[PDB]
């Protein structure tokens with residue numbers, strides 16, 4: 146579906162996050178081979194990234210805004226779960242997620258299909 150809320154997540158939320166200076170590690174799936182992390186996929190069972198979310202928004206994959214929101218959440222949560230407390234990546238995720246939440250607080254309240 147196209148909804149008012151999904152249009153918002155696409156044109157306001159993703160728009161802001163995608164171009165953020167800290168976005169680059171999150172624009173594509175975590176590549177466990179490239180990064181030397183052979184336990185990554187044993188720990189994280191549902192990988193998620195903004196490239197996947199963006200593509201899903203562009204292709205009208207989502208039925209409701211909450212589904213898109215859950216994918217954003219999964220991406221951040223995977224990052225906090227997998228990495229060490231002191232890894233810079235965790236700070237970058239937090240910075241992006243703060244913006245995610247700020248923008249979500251202003252999303253149109255009632256979902257309507259267009």
Ligand SMILES: CC(=O)NCc1onc(C)c1-c1ccc(C)c(S(=O)(=O)NC2CCCC2)c1
Nearest residue numbers: 170171173174175180193194195220224233234
């Ligand atoms: C999709 C997603 O969540 N990506 C971020 C992410 O989540 N878990 C891992 C691991 C990652 C992640 C993705 C890409 C890179 C390159 C890295 S890193 O730790 O090697 N580099 C960081 C420190 C220096 C700059 C960035 C971590």
